[PDB]
Amino acid sequence: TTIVGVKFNNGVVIAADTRSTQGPIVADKNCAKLHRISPKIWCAGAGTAADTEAVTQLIGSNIELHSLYTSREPRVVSALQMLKQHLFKYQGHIGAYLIVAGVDPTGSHLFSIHAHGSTDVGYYLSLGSGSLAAMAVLESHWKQDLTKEEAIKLASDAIQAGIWNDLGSGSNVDVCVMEIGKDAEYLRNYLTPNVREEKQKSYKFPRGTTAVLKESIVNICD
Amino acid sequence: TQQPIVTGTSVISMKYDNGVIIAADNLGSYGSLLRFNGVERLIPVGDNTVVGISGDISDMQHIERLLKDLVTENAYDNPLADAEEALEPSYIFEYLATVMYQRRSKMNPLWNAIIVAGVQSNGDQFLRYVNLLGVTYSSPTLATGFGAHMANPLLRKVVDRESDIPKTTVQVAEEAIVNAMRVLYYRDARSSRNFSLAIIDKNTGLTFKKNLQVENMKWDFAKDIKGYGTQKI
Amino acid sequence: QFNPYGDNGGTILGIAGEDFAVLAGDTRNITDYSINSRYEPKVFDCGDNIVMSANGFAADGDALVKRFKNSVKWYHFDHNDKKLSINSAARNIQHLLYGKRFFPYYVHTIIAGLDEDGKGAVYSFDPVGSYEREQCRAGGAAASLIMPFLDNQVNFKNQYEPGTNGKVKKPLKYLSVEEVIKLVRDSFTSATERHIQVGDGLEILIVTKDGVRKEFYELKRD
Amino acid sequence: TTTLAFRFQGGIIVAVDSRATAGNWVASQTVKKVIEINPFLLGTMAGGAADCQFWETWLGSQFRLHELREKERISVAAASKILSNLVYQYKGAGLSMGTMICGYTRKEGPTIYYVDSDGTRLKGDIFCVGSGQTFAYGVLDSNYKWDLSVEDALYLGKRSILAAAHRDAYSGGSVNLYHVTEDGWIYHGNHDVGELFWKVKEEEGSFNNVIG
Amino acid sequence: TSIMAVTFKDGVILGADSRTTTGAYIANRVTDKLTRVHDKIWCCRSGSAADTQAIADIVQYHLELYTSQYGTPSTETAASVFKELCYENKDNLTAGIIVAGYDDKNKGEVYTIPLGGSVHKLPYAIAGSGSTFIYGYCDKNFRENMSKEETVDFIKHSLSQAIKWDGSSGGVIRMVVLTAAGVERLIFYPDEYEQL
Amino acid sequence: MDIILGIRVQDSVILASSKAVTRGISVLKDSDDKTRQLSPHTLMSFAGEAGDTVQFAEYIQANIQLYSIREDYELSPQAVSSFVRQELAKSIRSRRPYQVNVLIGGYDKKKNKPELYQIDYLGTKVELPYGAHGYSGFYTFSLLDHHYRPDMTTEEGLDLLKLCVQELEKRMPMDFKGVIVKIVDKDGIRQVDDF
Amino acid sequence: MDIILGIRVQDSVILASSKAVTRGISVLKDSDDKTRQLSPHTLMSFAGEAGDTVQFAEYIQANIQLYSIREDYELSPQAVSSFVRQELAKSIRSRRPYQVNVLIGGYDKKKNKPELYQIDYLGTKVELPYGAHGYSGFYTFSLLDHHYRPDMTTEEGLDLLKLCVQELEKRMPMDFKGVIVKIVDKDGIRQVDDF
Amino acid sequence: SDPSSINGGIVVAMTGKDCVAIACDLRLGSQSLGVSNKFEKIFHYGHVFLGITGLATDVTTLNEMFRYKTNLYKLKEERAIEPETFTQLVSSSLYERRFGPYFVGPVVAGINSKSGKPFIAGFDLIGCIDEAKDFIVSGTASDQLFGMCESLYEPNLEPEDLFETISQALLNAADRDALSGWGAVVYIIKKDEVVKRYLKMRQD
Amino acid sequence: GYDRALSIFSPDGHIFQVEYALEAVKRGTCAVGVKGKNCVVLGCERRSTLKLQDTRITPSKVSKIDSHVVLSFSGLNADSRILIEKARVEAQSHRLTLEDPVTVEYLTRYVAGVQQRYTQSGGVR
Numbered sequence A: 001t002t003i004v005g006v007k008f009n010n011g012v013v014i015a016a017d018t019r020s021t022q023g024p025i026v027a028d029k030n031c032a033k034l035h036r037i038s039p040k041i042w043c044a045g046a047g048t049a050a051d052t053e054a055v056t057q058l059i060g061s062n063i064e065l066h067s068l069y070t071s072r073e074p075r076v077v078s079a080l081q082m083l084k085q086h087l088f089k090y091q092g093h094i095g096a097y098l099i100v101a102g103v104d105p106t107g108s109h110l111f112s113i114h115a116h117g118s119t120d121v122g123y124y125l126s127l128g129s130g131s132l133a134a135m136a137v138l139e140s141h142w143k144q145d146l147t148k149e150e151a152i153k154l155a156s157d158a159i160q161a162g163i164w165n166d167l168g169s170g171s172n173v174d175v176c177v178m179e180i181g182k183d184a185e186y187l188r189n190y191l192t193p194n195v196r197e198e199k200q201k202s203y204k205f206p207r208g209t210t211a212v213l214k215e216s217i218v219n220i221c222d
Numbered sequence B: 001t002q003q004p005i006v007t008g009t010s011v012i013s014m015k016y017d018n019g020v021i022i023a024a025d026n027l028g029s030y031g032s033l034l035r036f037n038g039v040e041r042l043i044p045v046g047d048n049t050v051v052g053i054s055g056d057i058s059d060m061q062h063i064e065r066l067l068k069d070l071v072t073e074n075a076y077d078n079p080l081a082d083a084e085e086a087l088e089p090s091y092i093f094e095y096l097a098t099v100m101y102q103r104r105s106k107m108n109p110l111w112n113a114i115i116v117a118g119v120q121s122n123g124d125q126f127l128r129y130v131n132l133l134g135v136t137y138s139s140p141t142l143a144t145g146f147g148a149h150m151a152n153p154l155l156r157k158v159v160d161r162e163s164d165i166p167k168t169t170v171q172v173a174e175e176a177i178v179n180a181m182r183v184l185y186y187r188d189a190r191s192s193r194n195f196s197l198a199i200i201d202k203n204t205g206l207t208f209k210k211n212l213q214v215e216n217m218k219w220d221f222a223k224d225i226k227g228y229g230t231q232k233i
Numbered sequence C: 001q002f003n004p005y006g007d008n009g010g011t012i013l014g015i016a017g018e019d020f021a022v023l024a025g026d027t028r029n030i031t032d033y034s035i036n037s038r039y040e041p042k043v044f045d046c047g048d049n050i051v052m053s054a055n056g057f058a059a060d061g062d063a064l065v066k067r068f069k070n071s072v073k074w075y076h077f078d079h080n081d082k083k084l085s086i087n088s089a090a091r092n093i094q095h096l097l098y099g100k101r102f103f104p105y106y107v108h109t110i111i112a113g114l115d116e117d118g119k120g121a122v123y124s125f126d127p128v129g130s131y132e133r134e135q136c137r138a139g140g141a142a143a144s145l146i147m148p149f150l151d152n153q154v155n156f157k158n159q160y161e162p163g164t165n166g167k168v169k170k171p172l173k174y175l176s177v178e179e180v181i182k183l184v185r186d187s188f189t190s191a192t193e194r195h196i197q198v199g200d201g202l203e204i205l206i207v208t209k210d211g212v213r214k215e216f217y218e219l220k221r222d
Numbered sequence D: 001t002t003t004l005a006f007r008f009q010g011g012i013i014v015a016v017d018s019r020a021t022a023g024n025w026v027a028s029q030t031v032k033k034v035i036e037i038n039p040f041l042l043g044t045m046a047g048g049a050a051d052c053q054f055w056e057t058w059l060g061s062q063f064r065l066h067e068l069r070e071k072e073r074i075s076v077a078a079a080s081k082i083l084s085n086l087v088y089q090y091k092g093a094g095l096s097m098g099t100m101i102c103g104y105t106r107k108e109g110p111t112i113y114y115v116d117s118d119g120t121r122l123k124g125d126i127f128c129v130g131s132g133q134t135f136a137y138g139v140l141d142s143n144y145k146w147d148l149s150v151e152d153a154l155y156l157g158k159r160s161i162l163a164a165a166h167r168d169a170y171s172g173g174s175v176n177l178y179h180v181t182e183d184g185w186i187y188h189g190n191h192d193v194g195e196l197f198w199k200v201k202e203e204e205g206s207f208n209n210v211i212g
Numbered sequence E: 001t002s003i004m005a006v007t008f009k010d011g012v013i014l015g016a017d018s019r020t021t022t023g024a025y026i027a028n029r030v031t032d033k034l035t036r037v038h039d040k041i042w043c044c045r046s047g048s049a050a051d052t053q054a055i056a057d058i059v060q061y062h063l064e065l066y067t068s069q070y071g072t073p074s075t076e077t078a079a080s081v082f083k084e085l086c087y088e089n090k091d092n093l094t095a096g097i098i099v100a101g102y103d104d105k106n107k108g109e110v111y112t113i114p115l116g117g118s119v120h121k122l123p124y125a126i127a128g129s130g131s132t133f134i135y136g137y138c139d140k141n142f143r144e145n146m147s148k149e150e151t152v153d154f155i156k157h158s159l160s161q162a163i164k165w166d167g168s169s170g171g172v173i174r175m176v177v178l179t180a181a182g183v184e185r186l187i188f189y190p191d192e193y194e195q196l
Numbered sequence F, G: 001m002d003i004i005l006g007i008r009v010q011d012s013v014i015l016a017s018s019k020a021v022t023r024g025i026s027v028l029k030d031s032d033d034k035t036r037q038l039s040p041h042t043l044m045s046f047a048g049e050a051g052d053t054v055q056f057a058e059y060i061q062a063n064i065q066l067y068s069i070r071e072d073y074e075l076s077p078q079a080v081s082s083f084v085r086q087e088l089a090k091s092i093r094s095r096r097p098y099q100v101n102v103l104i105g106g107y108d109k110k111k112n113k114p115e116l117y118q119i120d121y122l123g124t125k126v127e128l129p130y131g132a133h134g135y136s137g138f139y140t141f142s143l144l145d146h147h148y149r150p151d152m153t154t155e156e157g158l159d160l161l162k163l164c165v166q167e168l169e170k171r172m173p174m175d176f177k178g179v180i181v182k183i184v185d186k187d188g189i190r191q192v193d194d195f
Numbered sequence H: 001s002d003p004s005s006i007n008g009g010i011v012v013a014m015t016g017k018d019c020v021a022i023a024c025d026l027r028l029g030s031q032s033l034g035v036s037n038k039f040e041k042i043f044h045y046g047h048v049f050l051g052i053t054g055l056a057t058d059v060t061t062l063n064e065m066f067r068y069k070t071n072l073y074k075l076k077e078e079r080a081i082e083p084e085t086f087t088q089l090v091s092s093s094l095y096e097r098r099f100g101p102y103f104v105g106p107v108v109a110g111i112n113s114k115s116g117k118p119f120i121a122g123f124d125l126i127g128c129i130d131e132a133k134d135f136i137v138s139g140t141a142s143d144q145l146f147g148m149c150e151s152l153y154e155p156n157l158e159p160e161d162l163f164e165t166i167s168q169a170l171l172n173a174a175d176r177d178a179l180s181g182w183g184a185v186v187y188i189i190k191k192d193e194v195v196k197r198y199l200k201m202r203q204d
Numbered sequence I: 001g002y003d004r005a006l007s008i009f010s011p012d013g014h015i016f017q018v019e020y021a022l023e024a025v026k027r028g029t030c031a032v033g034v035k036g037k038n039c040v041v042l043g044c045e046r047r048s049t050l051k052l053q054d055t056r057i058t059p060s061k062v063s064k065i066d067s068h069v070v071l072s073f074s075g076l077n078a079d080s081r082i083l084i085e086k087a088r089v090e091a092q093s094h095r096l097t098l099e100d101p102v103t104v105e106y107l108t109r110y111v112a113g114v115q116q117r118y119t120q121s122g123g124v125r
């Protein structure tokens, strides 16, 4: 995977590619790596696919119950603390590498979490196999006081660097923008620069090509 | 069977409209210790080729001697040693590529990654890679070590395919290389600020730049960063 | 401890027709998750209407092609410029490979051309020299993806005549050069989608009595 | 692989499959596992494909040189012993070969020799070699008699390979038949298991474990 | 890492680089290794990022609970809590921590806690991979009862050398000043400290 | 423990099990019965790790006999086999798993049909016309593929079984000291004394 | 390769050698003769690693036959055994040693006495009244301790040998497919066809 | 001793115009030894179909487990479980055994009875969901199946045409794998009828 | 090693060393071979200037190469031993690899080949 996070004027934006591997084989050409912990706290995940999904859902569930209990909108630091303490307890065996971001009554935030339970703070971050390709772009083009449209451009460019140059990443670019005072917008397939070309030939077989031994109606009803 | 002791990190390079550019920092690391700081890892051969070497420095110095000796041997009984029968980049590469593969085949490798950059007699740009395994490949941009992971992505934004080479000037190309060297200083734990850069042009020839430094760095934003999560001070 | 072998990825494909033969291969070269080159050819004209590719560890691949090209040269010197027949080339290659039985060339080798009756021929080799003439062969990283597709479309395997109760098989016939290139292009676009080490570009070498033609096609660069 | 050859009243039958594997990957279904060394000598191949194919081809060159030097076809015993002495020199180096040298001469009559890569050399009437050798033995032994006809012997050899091709995951493709007489070897065709299995099931009434 | 803490006339100063690594890749070039466990008790973190963070979080929790019941804890007390965690979990931890704090009675104090979990009270302390290269320098140049400006120069020059030689250290030099006046944060960028 | 076979025919299930018990370079016993009666119309043969085999077989036997007393009813071969599979399926993820392979031959009195189940130590169940565990299968399966017919009698099945034992005695490396044969049908379980 | 025995009696030496050749889970042959005639009054049986056995036996056979032609004379069993021991004693410190154990049974025509030598792959020679290689000895030695007498006839020796084979067939784990028996005496070497 | 490839087997699923198809081979073996040629790998709970490849004892165990769970679901909910919901239940159940997992490669297929939308999905052994518009593959010949499906597949195929495509994908993939084959079954699933067809394939 | 080419051509196309070796044969005691319908007989001369000989132990003129082949000679006695030894070794080597004793033609061809090798090898006569 390639995943990034970029802070801007009035909030934060995160992005991710959509490739899912299984050894050298591409299992899913368009999987969703952007996860919703709460309405305005989102999470980009890299590493063991089941772990990033499971850990994000568990903490997301507990965050919802906490929000109802306290009658308050959830904070990013709460999600951060709950995630890191969970991961640390499992001594790295739960292979989740996360970029946590969102807006809350305190302001806008951007963090990263590693499988062993260490957290880092920053204005721009990148995780996954294509993090070096992405970070190279971020280090070259990032500046202080980015606008919304500039941060989306920088974030998606960093993901593209991973898509093209890293074999672990590919296909499309997902984006989620979290601005202060507004609803978070989830931009599924924000870019689709890897469309499959028309095939040279149709492989529709003449009916009856396959040899059959038995037929039978299956009963699905009661 | 070897293990590398004193080592050199990334070497980066690319093609442009009239020639090729190559660069590499001046560090000789001893594990985590940044032991030697005056190490030149770009070695010119004639006035038309530059060999950039990463990996073990003792093996680099051996290769230096071989190239030095190659120039001597070519001059023997050769009236056109500074003209038609001068050493080409393609000759120098193939020689090294032969040596590297012979050494790996004897289970006693020269623990290096090498990039031969230069210009041929007919004006064509030459840029090709070879390493301890004897593996060879060519591309509009080439880089070793961390450079492969961080520099190539940046350099490929300038020259993504063959047709982008005529469209790329020497000013634009050098700017990209110098930028890449800064990124490597940010992110490679075995890199140094000081580096060397070489340009081989079909018109202006060989330009060798020593004692360059990474500059125009962004560090100011660091002061705003506090704690690792919930600290406010 | 030093490891003398490496994996440079890529995949190759050979198909034979009635009066022609093709040998295709992608132009991508890799190590681990990095791309080394987007255009590094590994299918070569070796003279005497013989095309060759040795996919796998590129250093061993280059060494082998280099030695066979040299073998062809010395065959002319020692035997009065006689044309090296495809069957003779194959047997010679076996001895090159088996010569290093106890320190092998880590490559899958395929050659293509015309036999002495003018008919299309494809031979394939394992790393230590066992060989076999076939109508059809894929080799390299995505061989397991492409090969069963070829069984189905080139040799009409598992295809029966419609309405014959799976009793009459679909009859074997030679394919036109136009139809074969269609299958090659579709095979490589499919392999590019699902294998990370396959992409960037496709280079096909076609072999007829007139000589050796080339064709190039773009592939997805992610 | 699965290969067999047995001696009987009417000479020697030799039968092999045609599959080649690299782990669980079925690499080929059309491999020629019988080498025709000369009009009176055959060799079977099991184990490492390159090892078998290279050395049994080399073997035929040595036997050609024998008849040039001695003005006489090489004996089956001498032929098999050249191979066994060769592989013995490479003992421990990691060659993988399970071979059977089958042929006829005047002095010996019909003869079969088992030769493998750890140096074992055995004369005998019946042998099965390969990963599916046990499956072939089961059918072959339970139906074998010396007084089989040429027609029945050919079928039993074919049927024994089919049995192994079915059960052994690393055997299959097609059956190659050979018959060796006083006049030399005779090829009895390539038989694809795809069609042969169903033809045998219907006509013989066997293979009741399979869904018809 | 390269980290150090130095006592002086008016209190104590903590110092650190900003580099976090995965092998040879710098995962974070602007890391803050100086962290607050109490108003005027801070620590320098070296070793595993995950372990030192987990530990520092637990210590902050303990000292917050201590304050609620018994008032402000001593610097010695804080070091004892760090020790208790590091010693009792020595088999599962990779943490080299320097504890530094300012009392009004005891003034500036520095306690260092190596891998084993042992406690050592010192006038000044150095630790982390890059500390090996400055034992000679720091021993020759340290004096007791230095001024604020002198101590800042001592830490700056020391960490500058540690960074110069250690590949596992780099980025900016962060510092935290602990005195009766309050808490002051300082930062120093490469362009300044490299050419010292 | 080594050779256990099973053949289902028209009206019965026939189990054959080797008599040898070997440990080291000594055959300690040549008359061992590697089977337990689970119920009047259900028989289980077993083979595997020393100790584990008998301990497991008797544990199953006790449980099925307990069920029979409680409900005053005989469980079907299908039900018994499913119980056995689950016990092995639990076992494989235990601290120390049972390393036992079994064949369950039974006659279902409600369906009036013979049934043969093959279950390995992992808990892998399959119903078969003929079955075998261990190296035996590598000879007997291909043999039975050829000679087996579904409508055979018990006498035809015993001849078919003799054909298997002969092949094993010819081609197997170890001396397994012959077999004990038992038949399961509508009238229950009985042993063939002369084989 | 597995079972080789030897018994020296009053006027002859008797060697017994198993007929089975096994590889994996298959008995490839059940009529193998694990012996070579070195000279008219000297016989050597062998057992050990596949290939090594026959290669070694024939190499010795060639050397002894060469000596016989050169000198027009037959070497004594004692002389042959010492030659064999030295070849094995060289072998053990080679790059790849012969892993072969042998028994040499011969009749010395000058002394008019039968002689039996046991030599292992290390080159360890001993003259014995009765000998065995491999696991066979663990049964046969104690048996022969009890039943053997020095003044026995050839017929008494064959009965004594039958008593050994019976015990091995009862208690050995592997089926070795019987034995080929050969007698060495004043009249040379001959094979017993019905054993 | 690699649990996922001891017994062998494959499963594949595809979508079409207002229909779905799921297919599997019939082999169960012990490494090289083929044991059974009747071992089906596709099960169904109401109108939701589940295929499972991998270690056979776990295939059986999980079938029994999901039958158990879907039966309790139906009693309490008073309706049949839908493919989208069932997918989540499978994921939950597998991840519950995160550090001692069932060695399986399950595949869900079915049509949602409310919306009428065709649905397919795949999982890894610890429960990661892989949703797809086009096709899902699983088993010892997954590489082969990926290659066949990616080239042969086109969208919006009619049930009769879709049958040919999925059948040819399974057959030609199985013939390039030693541990897969020995017979095959294909399920064609329309909104309110389901046809099951046994394929004739080579028996080696 | 001693390399000298002792057997060489002369202007008239003769190899004198080979021809002088024939003179040594002409000096040697007579030997005769006659083959019948079902047998072969080898006759040999023994010079009678040697009395007080011990015929039990004195080397015999006819030598067995194998149990089925014999070799007699004329010329230098010491030389003959070397050929006989090489022949006897080759005889056992043939039985070992071909599993069949040598033919008389083969054994002759081998011995003749050895004799030829000494006519164009350096350092030997």
Ligand SMILES: *[C@@](C)(CO)[C@](*)(O)[C@H](CC(C)C)NC(=O)[C@H](Cc1ccccc1)NC(=O)[C@H](CC(C)C)NC(=O)[C@H](CCc1ccccc1)NC(=O)CN1CCOCC1
Residues within 6 Å of the ligand: A001, A002, A019, A020, A021, A022, A023, A027, A028, A031, A033, A045, A046, A047, A048, A049, A050, A052, A095, A128, A129, A168, A169, H004, H103, H104, H105, H123, H124, H125, H126, H128, H129, H130
């Ligand atoms: C980039 C693309 C690569 O790093 C991203 O980081 C993505 C993250 C996305 C998916 C959130 N990572 C992957 O795609 C990830 C790479 C990976 C593989 C293996 C271990 C760790 C990371 N791939 C996966 O997680 C796949 C998801 C599939 C496609 C549904 N799962 C697997 O590859 C599983 C790994 C399961 C596992 C077990 C124990 C510890 C860690 C992971 N592997 C298999 O299923 C392979 N095999 C199938 C046959 O049954 C045996 C297991």
Ligand SMILES: *[C@@](C)(CO)[C@](*)(O)[C@H](CC(C)C)NC(=O)[C@H](Cc1ccccc1)NC(=O)[C@H](CC(C)C)NC(=O)[C@H](CCc1ccccc1)NC(=O)CN1CCOCC1
Residues within 6 Å of the ligand: C101, C104, C126, C127, C128, C130, D001, D002, D019, D020, D021, D022, D023, D025, D027, D028, D031, D033, D045, D046, D047, D048, D049, D050, D052, D096, D130, D131, D170, D171
């Ligand atoms: C039955 C079918 C199986 O036992 C037979 O015994 C046949 C005998 C026939 C072919 C004469 N045996 C094989 O098919 C044999 C099995 C085998 C494999 C490897 C070692 C020993 C035995 N298969 C082969 O020899 C294959 C044939 C190729 C695929 C056509 N060859 C390989 O696997 C080669 C060579 C292996 C090797 C041996 C010795 C030294 C070095 C290498 N290896 C590869 O092709 C590697 N691999 C294939 C998959 O793709 C990635 C690379």
Ligand SMILES: *[C@@](C)(CO)[C@](*)(O)[C@H](CC(C)C)NC(=O)[C@H](Cc1ccccc1)NC(=O)[C@H](CC(C)C)NC(=O)[C@H](CCc1ccccc1)NC(=O)CN1CCOCC1
Residues within 6 Å of the ligand: A114, A116, A118, E001, E002, E019, E020, E021, E022, E023, E027, E031, E033, E045, E046, E047, E048, E049, E050, E052, E094, E128, E129, E168, E169
């Ligand atoms: C200097 C740099 C060294 O002493 C400092 O002490 C800093 C201290 C600060 C950051 C608090 N130490 C590190 O930066 C520390 C060095 C280190 C590495 C490994 C073990 C102990 C210490 N780095 C880390 O902790 C990183 C931080 C991540 C990148 C945010 N973590 C890793 O490198 C993980 C840790 C796993 C681990 C191993 C042993 C004990 C505890 C945790 N290691 C990996 O991910 C391994 N990596 C996998 C990819 O291939 C390269 C190796």
Ligand SMILES: [Cl-]
Residues within 6 Å of the ligand: A119, B228, E020, E031, E032, E033, E049, E053
């Ligand atoms: Cl940190």
Ligand SMILES: [Mg+2]
Residues within 6 Å of the ligand: D164, D165, D166, D167, D168, D169, D170, D171, D172, H203, H204
């Ligand atoms: Mg098979």
Ligand SMILES: [Mg+2]
Residues within 6 Å of the ligand: E163, E164, E165, E166, E167, E168, E169, E170
């Ligand atoms: Mg530094």
Ligand SMILES: [Mg+2]
Residues within 6 Å of the ligand: H174, H175, H176, H177, H178, H179, H180, H181, H182, H204
């Ligand atoms: Mg198959």
